[PDB]
Amino acid sequence: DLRLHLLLNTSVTCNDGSPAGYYLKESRGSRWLLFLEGGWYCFNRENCDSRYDTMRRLMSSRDWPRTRTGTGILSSQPEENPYWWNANMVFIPYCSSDVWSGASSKSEKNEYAFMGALIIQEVVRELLGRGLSGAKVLLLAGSSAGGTGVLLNVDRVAEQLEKLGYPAIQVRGLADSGWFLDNKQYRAPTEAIRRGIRYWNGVVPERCRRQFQEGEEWNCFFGYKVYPTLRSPVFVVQWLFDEAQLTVDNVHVQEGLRLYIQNLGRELRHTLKDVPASFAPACLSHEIIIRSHWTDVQVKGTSLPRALHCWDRSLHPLKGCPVHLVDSCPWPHCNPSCPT
Numbered sequence: 001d002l003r004l005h006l007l008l009n010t011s012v013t014c015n016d017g018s019p020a021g022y023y024l025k026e027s028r029g030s031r032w033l034l035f036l037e038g039g040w041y042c043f044n045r046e047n048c049d050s051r052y053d054t055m056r057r058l059m060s061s062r063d064w065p066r067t068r069t070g071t072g073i074l075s076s077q078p079e080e081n082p083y084w085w086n087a088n089m090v091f092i093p094y095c096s097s098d099v100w101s102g103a104s105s106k107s108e109k110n111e112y113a114f115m116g117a118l119i120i121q122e123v124v125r126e127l128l129g130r131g132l133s134g135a136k137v138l139l140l141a142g143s144s145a146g147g148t149g150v151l152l153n154v155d156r157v158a159e160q161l162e163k164l165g166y167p168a169i170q171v172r173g174l175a176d177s178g179w180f181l182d183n184k185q186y187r188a189p190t191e192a193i194r195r196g197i198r199y200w201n202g203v204v205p206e207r208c209r210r211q212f213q214e215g216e217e218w219n220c221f222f223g224y225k226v227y228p229t230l231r232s233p234v235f236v237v238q239w240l241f242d243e244a245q246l247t248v249d250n251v252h253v254q255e256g257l258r259l260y261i262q263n264l265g266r267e268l269r270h271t272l273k274d275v276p277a278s279f280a281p282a283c284l285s286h287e288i289i290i291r292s293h294w295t296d297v298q299v300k301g302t303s304l305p306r307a308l309h310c311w312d313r314s315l316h317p318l319k320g321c322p323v324h325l326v327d328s329c330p331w332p333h334c335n336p337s338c339p340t
């Protein structure tokens, strides 16, 4: 079990002004995994009000429980988590509705606070006094909106630790199910994100901002565009036929739809050709890393926990221990190990 700590700086808040926080389980014999929860987002007063009625735990800490159980990559049992398992474990709840990009407080002009980028910085800050100062690796991981959040924030964490005087901590990223395409729909994300950035005062990585310039920062929310601007090592996990991608594409089988689905998989595979650390199975699904049975899926005979271990070794190719694992077969569940 991981134990809740609300942020000591109570000006760093969830949407409704309640304090943000993190859940922690220390492992004193180990030198850190910080995981970003996902859960869509909201981009105007009306749709944020709706989310506050029926998804309030994603906008407030008032009802959070005192503990949570670590699962998947957050599990401390080697049977469930062959990778790491002995690491210090941190789960950061998503309560900012801003894909972890916001830097704006609640005020007389703002009904809600959007502080995702500042929540991450404050968590890292308060952890340094609880043992993070002695770390050798900090892995910033996340699923869905949290996976996009890794891409937007990993280099800022590295810069923060350098400026605070901790140059020996190696910061790395693991982005799960947050690598989306701004593609043609079958019957939109780009417009919703463009409006969100204005509403949230959203921030993107500096090198990506300088490429796309004012008004075009929405481009940096799309993995294949922001990834080449990043300096920290990042491992990318993405289903080739992601259910959230298909949902925004208005897909819920005749020739037209067959060709659309096959072209989606081919496009995703193309965007990963130059990503040396990646795991991309040919399955229709969504998310992976915090599921208890995350060890079952294999690409070309290699599981995700093994691929991550091989990545660790590469950061010290390796005989029989690969890190670039992308299916080439063209239809959902052509890989027999896909989740049932």
Ligand SMILES: *[C@@H]1O[C@H](CO)[C@@H](O)[C@H](O)[C@H]1NC(C)=O
Binding pocket: 009, 011, 012, 118
């Ligand atoms: C609390 O966080 C805010 C936002 O980052 C910052 O401006 C302020 O200085 C912090 N306060 C303290 C006491 O650290």
Ligand SMILES: CCC(=O)Nc1nc(C)cs1
Binding pocket: 038, 039, 040, 041, 099, 144, 145, 148, 180, 189, 193, 221, 222, 244
């Ligand atoms: C919130 C996760 C999701 O389904 N969609 C996202 N789209 C972008 C562009 C970031 S997160």
Ligand SMILES: CCC(=O)Nc1nc(C)cs1
Binding pocket: 313, 314, 315, 316, 318
């Ligand atoms: C990167 C060189 C290499 O093979 N690394 C190794 N790591 C272990 C754990 C044994 S050898």
